[PDB]
Amino acid sequence: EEGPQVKIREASKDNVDFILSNVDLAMANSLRRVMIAEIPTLAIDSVEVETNTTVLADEFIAHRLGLIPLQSMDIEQLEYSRDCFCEDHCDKCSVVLTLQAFGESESTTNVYSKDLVIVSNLMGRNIGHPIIQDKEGNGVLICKLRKGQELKLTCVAKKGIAKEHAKWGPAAAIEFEYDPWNKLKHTDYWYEQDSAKEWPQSKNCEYEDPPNEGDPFDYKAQADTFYMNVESVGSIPVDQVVVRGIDTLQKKVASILLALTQM
Amino acid sequence: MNAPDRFELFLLGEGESKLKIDPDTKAPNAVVITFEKEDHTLGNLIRAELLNDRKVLFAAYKVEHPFFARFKLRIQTTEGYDPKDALKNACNSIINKLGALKTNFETEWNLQTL
Amino acid sequence: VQQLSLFGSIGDDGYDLLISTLTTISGNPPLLYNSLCTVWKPNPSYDVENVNSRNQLVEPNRIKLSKEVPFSYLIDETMMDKPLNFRILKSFESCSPWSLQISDIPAAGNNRSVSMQTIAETIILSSAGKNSSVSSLMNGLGYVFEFQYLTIGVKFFMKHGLILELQKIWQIEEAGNSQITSGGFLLKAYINVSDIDRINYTETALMNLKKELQGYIELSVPDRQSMDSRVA
Amino acid sequence: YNVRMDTMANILYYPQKPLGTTRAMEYLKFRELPAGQNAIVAIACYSGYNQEDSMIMNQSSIDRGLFRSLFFRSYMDQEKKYGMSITETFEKPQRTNTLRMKHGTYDKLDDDGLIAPGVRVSGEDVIIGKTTPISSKRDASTPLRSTENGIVDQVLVTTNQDGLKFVKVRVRTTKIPQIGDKFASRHGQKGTIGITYRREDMPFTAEGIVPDLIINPHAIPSRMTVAHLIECLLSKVAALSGNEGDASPFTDITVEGISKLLREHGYQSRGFEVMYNGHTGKKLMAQIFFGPTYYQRLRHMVDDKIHARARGPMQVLTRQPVEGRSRDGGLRFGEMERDCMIAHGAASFLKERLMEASDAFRVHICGICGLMTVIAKLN
Amino acid sequence: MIVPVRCFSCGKVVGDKWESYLNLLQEDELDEGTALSRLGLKRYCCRRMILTHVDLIEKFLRYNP
Amino acid sequence: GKSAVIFVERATPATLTELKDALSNSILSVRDPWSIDFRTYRCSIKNLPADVSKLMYSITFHHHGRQTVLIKDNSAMVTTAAAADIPPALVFNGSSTGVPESIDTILSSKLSNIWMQRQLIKGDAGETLILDGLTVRLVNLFSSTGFKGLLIELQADEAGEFETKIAGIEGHLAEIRAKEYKTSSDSLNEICDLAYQYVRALE
Amino acid sequence: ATLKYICAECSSKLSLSRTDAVRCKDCGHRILLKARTKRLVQFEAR
Amino acid sequence: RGNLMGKRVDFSARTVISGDPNLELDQVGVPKSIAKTLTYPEVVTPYNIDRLTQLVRNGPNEHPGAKYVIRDSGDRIDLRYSKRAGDIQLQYGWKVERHIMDNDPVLFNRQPSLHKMSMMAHRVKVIPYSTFRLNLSVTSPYNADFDGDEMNLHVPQSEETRAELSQLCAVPLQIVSPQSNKPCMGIVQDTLCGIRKLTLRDTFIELDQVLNMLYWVPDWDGVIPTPAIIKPKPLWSGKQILSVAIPNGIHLQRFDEGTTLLSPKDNGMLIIDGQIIFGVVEKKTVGSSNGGLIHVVTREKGPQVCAKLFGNIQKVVNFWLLHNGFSTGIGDTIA
Amino acid sequence: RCSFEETVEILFEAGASAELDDCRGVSENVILGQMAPIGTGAFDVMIDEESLVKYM
Amino acid sequence: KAIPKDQRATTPYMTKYERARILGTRALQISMNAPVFVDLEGETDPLRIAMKELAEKKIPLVIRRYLPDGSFEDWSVEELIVDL
Amino acid sequence: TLSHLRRTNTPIAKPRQLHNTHWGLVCPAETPEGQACGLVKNL
RNA sequence: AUAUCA
Ligand SMILES: [Mg+2]
Ligand SMILES: [Zn+2]
Ligand SMILES: [Zn+2]
Ligand SMILES: [Zn+2]
Ligand SMILES: [Zn+2]
């Protein structure tokens, strides 16, 4: 087609395995960094506690509520409250979640991310839905109550990035490898007898030609072709972790061009 | 307690420009751009692209201390060529490269049935 | 703005001599002038904390609105056909432009050679809308009318920006205007300063004027507390 | 823990049983009530922020709850009876009829003189209002420690053996691992956090794994803490295998045995893993010894240590600065410090420390008998 | 005490997987290593989260008020 | 005189130029650049009588007098911090000190307990495009949180044909794919309606 | 409405004032708690 | 012993110490809170009047602010409560008790204090986080580590006292000590470990990294040194790019067991005009050694120049090792 | 002598022997809170009106 | 007793301690609004002013150098060699 | 808590050293550093 | 006073 090229190896709701060729390592990495840190997500940010009869602390629970993944598909049409014009929050900038739970049962009563209810007007946008990947359809286990154990609270979810808090991290681990045969001599293999026998062969070795000993060292050789795997948490779909990552980095660069323009 | 606010990493300070371009004294046709509320994510990316420019003689960046999200980038170009223009072109090249990367990923993704 | 000043006074009978003296000393005869001031305070019905968004203490203060009026509004029929000069003082839709001022209590210091007061001022040029009267606008800011006074006098322009005002003040109420200065005139000498130098230079100018009138009329530094408009 | 009122209680948010365990721990109830968490630990040279017993923490992990802890302090106060008439009282003191009030705020007190549980507090604020009537009455109230803050957890009212009304107040905070915060492995390998890096800055395996902790290679040699390295290797196998790693003393487990098992899992037998630099993405020329190691959070946290003074309370007798952080004391410029100043030749710097910066006073003496006899009616 | 939502090292939600893991052990008799892997917990950082958890909450619930 | 303000919510720093070119064949000349500050204040009074806003807007025009118009509850107050704009009579009788400052400085330093600055939008290096009987001003508005949008100021002496002029500019916006924008030409004294229009288009 | 103090064991609400008798109604136990403020507390979810 | 010969003092501060590869030898990282408490009484003078008035305006809560104003009259104005804390108009001769600020001289000390070097004068550097940060090479004189050590800070109150600190006991002055007539500070840990690794014959650096390594040197002439290898592929050696930190005029010669002018084992040391000719840099060269690169630099160029060299050598070395990496495992005990 | 080890038994003897301390030791001036006669304080500093009037 | 200028035998060079004390003293005096004997070439820090005065030997101070017997030699800052 | 209920104090020939007779009765490692070293035994 | 910290 044009410049750098992609070749997807495997896909799911949760994973994207692909090959990125005709790219600078610096670019591959900068994208990898952005996916981890700069993609916006919606996550619980304020927790007003009306009642808590639980064995857990108000803030212990509060902390967990932030780590619960929320639907951030249409996150782009929500404003950062900081940029919003209200007094604290509103609809244009937040999602209000409610949680009322009580131990009616003699048996232990469980509190799940499913038990969260949206109270704010969604403006008909795909946002704030607790992500349920759970087979039984419960989502994240927030708490356990016994008998008169009541938990009544209110959550304000806000747009944010992983730089502010890791709760707004839409990506789990991002796998990243290049040159499975150390052709580039980018690592000096620690060994005891044989580095080839001692160090396990990469999966990606199959997608590259072995060096063949009867050849001189390619110094001219440079790093292109990157075997990556992007894992999603739920907030954004796997593809959009890649796309939005590409786009964020693009926007980030545009700001610099624009800054120079104003100067 | 002595902990700085987390947004200080990305949100520009009161009266604080993203870029501050100062000229290098020690070398002819060389400049020093300080990037506020930025990290390696952008620094190493730009530096590597300026390296691809033939008319660029020197390019390097450094995050002087990790408590602060800012980096100094030094650009030296051949006489007649402007380092601000060099930075402008590398910035553009990056965008155009990313634009193709997105297009190529999108096309390839749409082909998958999973 | 920093206003450095000194005050004094004289009884009605001292008028002519003082005018004659200031005319010779400054080289120019007096210039007639007036001004109406309306003072406003935070609405007592409303109540707000006295702190910043940064949670820093803020002291409630009065806002002063001031403008002029055409002299003809101060001359009745008995006053009619009387030289419109310095001698007259003896026989005593939208909003208009106004001067809006908030002042600070003068600078502290024992043995101050002059009074030094900081003054925050802005100018109101006009208004429009539902409630465009200056009164409504003050209310919109959360303030209410407290009191107002009229001042009539003569001024002298001197060197280095020194100005001398010989004034009479009347508080205004439907119950009637009462002359705060009944008996004589309030004398004021001052310079408005927008660097330490120009401040010490201005003090000198005032000190030389004080020195030049010593023996005849005395100019001194009024009590700080008497120049404090804070509400309490 | 939730039902007891003790001065100070430290509880770990998410305790973990160790991957490497002793057969003896079964009896010690350790796996049921643990003292730490299994951290992903890289023994590497990174930004040099892990030099001389310091360590780097994954700021990303810290956000996710790694090493956070609950903190409960309990403040007590009595309503004492001083003889036939004088009795202290629980109430909200009014500043007009009450002497020597605390500069802190009393607004958070209900009319019984207590804060209701749930209110958030902060430094210098008044938890318990008390007055010791003597005549109208002095202020005997209890303020929260100035170096701390949090939310009131529980407040209880009681009478004692003889029936003196007394009240206990619990205050809960959550302490999130900061910089000078001390941690150690189970091998006398202690240290404080030097810096916290986010996930992107951290070095990473091709597999996408990142360390929670970066400890310096320079620890290991001089110290000869071999079991630390073995703990790790075994814990790595344990984590993959899902079997309890037996780290018991006198056994037939060998570093070779564990090595073989790790190779069966796809990793390089001696625990090394190739890492990529977080800032550039470029492979590290070195391969990092990487795997889980059980790290402990210790009682020494920077914020309970940090202290500064510049004029403050003085003793009555000596008229010199009071003692300890607690009392807002000044530090001791002691004998050995005097010596260094004398060695430097800092004559005026010393005079200042001993006079202006502390003790300094003025007397009038007699010229005949060099005594402090002089009745100076200096006025 | 109480399963961590999200693995500390990579942040893969682990909050849902608890009961499911405990079930694959009692009901399925399965060994810990297979259950973890069944649940898709492949990286050791994620594995250690569940494998080394101590659900103290369950004891805490044993006290009346 | 007449005016209208168009605020392009959905846009990027580039949108300005895109619209700038859609007029390339309508342009005539280009006068000096302009500037503008848009502040939002929130009242701290807690007894505020029902239906009295808690919001007050401050619109500062640069070299439109260095003037600042305050707008609250559909009412406006025009102020100036320019000693050169002081009515001569006020300087002569001493009502004024001859050295004024901004109403915003006064608000933040003397009335800060009553009024708190919530937001501050600034538009620098704006462009003055001169067409046929219609002056069109363009400027990129920025907040403390990066780009905030594009602002179009439409001033026309020609009291007549105007509704057409505004519709025309809105059309060139359709061309550059600038959808989801707000336009105001409302009214409450020129400077006042103009100021009001900014409020309607931005609030 | 209003529960000044709660009971430690039986968990029955008490609502008593100054000099009322520091004890519970039914069970003996002089323990007694305080019951949360009605001034709802908000926490950052970080 | 306890109230006269030693006493506790005001303008003192104490906290947990931690290291920093980005601090200069002679500076000390001071937590914002500590800086906001400790004060220097500055006399209102034509030179500072405007600045001082601003810190007064800034007040006790903002960082570069002030706590008190001392009038001629003797009475102390508390900026925290004075109703006139805003409209405070300074007069020559008054004193503004202002916060401790970047580059103030301060006494830093690690107890016991069995050394004059156990108390040295550092430049303030107000920083975030609750720990006192120190340059790693200054670790040895104090005898500090970061396993939970705390350190003491004393603030001079007079222009005289400050001079005493800056002019007699400042860290650079203390480098060569009379205890053993040799340097008492040298290159340690990461920087020592990385310095050997960098300076092997095997060690070659590509252009990209050379540029970053060069820019990292804060006094770099702007001159890209000619690569030791010009085609096939321009390549620089460790020795080469380390020599950029070594100042001109610096001459050093050392022969270790088996050193020839051909140094086959890359033995000993040969630095001509502050450029390494042969041998690997390690403890004997860059440590707190009698013949040391440091001993020569302090003596030949100055204490201020040598102090800069510490920072320089570390900024290059640490940067290089950050990207090279270095670890240690059980495999290293296996024979 | 009293600042090391024998303190009170040294000051009693100091009394009955009517000792006179010339205050040249560093210890004395420290007890007295005066600038010790060591390095910086081993000499005196004077203004000379001659040299002063010479520079102007 | 005071040793005559023609019989002075202490170093013709200024001691580290002397220089530190002169700089301290001048800086202190400069800071207490004392008259400055040099062109401040934009200088504002009294120590940097002191350094400048000593650099041009325009400091009107004299070092009274005491000998163990009690006698002394007076030396002008203008006359002392500053090799430090 | 456990190790505190197994602590031994020894008040006032070479007591601090680990004796052979301490085998199986007292912990060879659990002892303080400084002043009380080897005088505080743990069962 | 015990415990503890380097
Ligand atoms: Mg230590
Ligand atoms: Zn909003
Ligand atoms: Zn006597
Ligand atoms: Zn994980
Ligand atoms: Zn009961």
Side-chain angles (χ1 to χ4, degrees), chain A residues 140-160:
Chain A
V140 156
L141 165 59
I142 306 164
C143 209
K144 290 173 189 187
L145 326 154
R146 63 128 49 182
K147 46 197 211 166
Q149 317 246 286
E150 195 183 322
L151 178 61
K152 208 167 176 197
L153 53 84
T154 298
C155 315
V156 185
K158 294 184 174 192
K159 190 178 189 175

Coordinates of all heavy atoms in Angstrom, one line a residue, chain A residues 140-160:
Chain A
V140 N -16.8 -8.0 38.0 CA -15.9 -7.9 39.1 C -16.6 -8.0 40.5 O -17.6 -7.3 40.7 CB -15.0 -6.7 38.9 CG1 -14.4 -6.2 40.3 CG2 -13.8 -7.0 38.0
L141 N -16.1 -8.9 41.4 CA -16.6 -9.0 42.7 C -16.0 -7.9 43.5 O -14.8 -7.8 43.8 CB -16.2 -10.4 43.3 CG -16.3 -10.7 44.8 CD1 -17.7 -10.5 45.3 CD2 -15.8 -12.1 45.1
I142 N -16.9 -7.0 43.9 CA -16.5 -5.8 44.7 C -16.4 -6.2 46.2 O -15.4 -5.9 46.9 CB -17.5 -4.6 44.4 CG1 -17.6 -4.3 42.9 CG2 -17.1 -3.4 45.2 CD1 -18.8 -3.4 42.5
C143 N -17.5 -6.8 46.7 CA -17.6 -7.0 48.1 C -18.4 -8.2 48.5 O -19.1 -8.8 47.8 CB -18.2 -5.7 48.8 SG -17.7 -5.5 50.5
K144 N -18.3 -8.6 49.8 CA -19.1 -9.7 50.4 C -19.7 -9.1 51.7 O -19.0 -8.5 52.5 CB -18.2 -10.9 50.8 CG -17.7 -11.7 49.5 CD -16.7 -12.8 49.9 CE -16.1 -13.4 48.7 NZ -15.2 -14.5 49.0
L145 N -21.0 -9.4 51.9 CA -21.8 -8.9 53.0 C -22.4 -10.1 53.7 O -22.7 -11.2 53.1 CB -22.9 -8.0 52.6 CG -22.7 -7.1 51.4 CD1 -24.0 -6.8 50.7 CD2 -22.0 -5.8 51.8
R146 N -22.7 -10.0 55.1 CA -23.3 -11.2 55.8 C -24.8 -11.1 56.0 O -25.6 -11.6 55.2 CB -22.5 -11.6 57.0 CG -22.3 -10.6 58.2 CD -22.8 -11.2 59.5 NE -22.2 -12.5 59.8 CZ -22.4 -13.2 60.9 NH1 -23.2 -12.8 61.9 NH2 -21.8 -14.4 61.1
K147 N -25.2 -10.4 57.0 CA -26.6 -10.2 57.3 C -27.0 -8.7 57.2 O -27.1 -8.3 56.1 CB -27.1 -10.9 58.7 CG -26.2 -10.7 59.9 CD -26.5 -11.7 61.0 CE -26.3 -11.3 62.4 NZ -26.9 -12.2 63.4
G148 N -27.0 -8.0 58.3 CA -27.3 -6.5 58.3 C -26.3 -5.7 57.6 O -26.2 -4.4 57.8
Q149 N -25.4 -6.3 56.8 CA -24.4 -5.6 56.1 C -24.9 -4.9 54.8 O -25.5 -5.6 53.9 CB -23.2 -6.6 55.7 CG -22.9 -7.5 56.9 CD -21.5 -7.3 57.5 OE1 -20.5 -7.6 56.9 NE2 -21.5 -6.8 58.7
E150 N -24.9 -3.6 54.9 CA -25.4 -2.7 53.9 C -24.3 -1.9 53.3 O -23.3 -1.6 54.0 CB -26.5 -1.7 54.5 CG -27.3 -1.0 53.5 CD -28.3 0.0 54.0 OE1 -28.9 -0.2 55.1 OE2 -28.5 1.1 53.4
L151 N -24.3 -1.7 52.0 CA -23.4 -0.9 51.3 C -24.2 0.0 50.3 O -24.8 -0.4 49.4 CB -22.3 -1.7 50.5 CG -21.3 -0.9 49.7 CD1 -20.5 0.0 50.6 CD2 -20.4 -1.8 48.9
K152 N -24.2 1.4 50.6 CA -24.9 2.3 49.8 C -23.9 3.4 49.5 O -23.4 4.1 50.4 CB -26.1 2.9 50.6 CG -27.3 3.3 49.8 CD -28.5 3.5 50.7 CE -29.7 4.0 50.1 NZ -30.7 4.6 51.1
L153 N -23.6 3.6 48.2 CA -22.7 4.6 47.7 C -23.0 5.1 46.3 O -23.9 4.5 45.6 CB -21.2 4.1 47.8 CG -20.9 2.7 47.2 CD1 -20.6 2.8 45.7 CD2 -19.7 2.2 47.8
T154 N -22.3 6.2 45.9 CA -22.5 6.8 44.6 C -21.1 7.1 43.9 O -20.2 7.6 44.6 CB -23.4 8.1 44.8 OG1 -24.6 7.6 45.2 CG2 -23.5 8.8 43.5
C155 N -21.1 6.7 42.7 CA -19.8 6.9 41.9 C -19.9 7.9 40.8 O -20.9 7.9 40.0 CB -19.4 5.5 41.4 SG -19.5 4.2 42.6
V156 N -18.9 8.7 40.6 CA -18.8 9.6 39.5 C -17.6 9.2 38.7 O -16.5 9.2 39.1 CB -18.6 11.1 40.0 CG1 -18.7 12.1 38.8 CG2 -19.7 11.5 41.0
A157 N -17.9 8.7 37.4 CA -16.9 8.2 36.6 C -16.5 9.4 35.6 O -17.4 10.1 35.2 CB -17.3 7.0 35.8
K158 N -15.2 9.5 35.4 CA -14.7 10.6 34.6 C -13.7 10.1 33.5 O -13.0 9.1 33.7 CB -14.0 11.7 35.5 CG -15.1 12.5 36.4 CD -14.4 13.6 37.2 CE -15.5 14.4 37.9 NZ -15.0 15.7 38.5
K159 N -13.5 10.9 32.4 CA -12.6 10.7 31.3 C -11.2 10.9 31.9 O -11.0 11.9 32.5 CB -12.9 11.6 30.1 CG -12.1 11.3 28.8 CD -12.5 12.2 27.7 CE -12.0 11.9 26.4 NZ -12.5 12.8 25.3
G160 N -10.3 10.0 31.6 CA -8.9 10.2 32.0 C -7.9 9.3 31.2 O -8.3 8.5 30.4

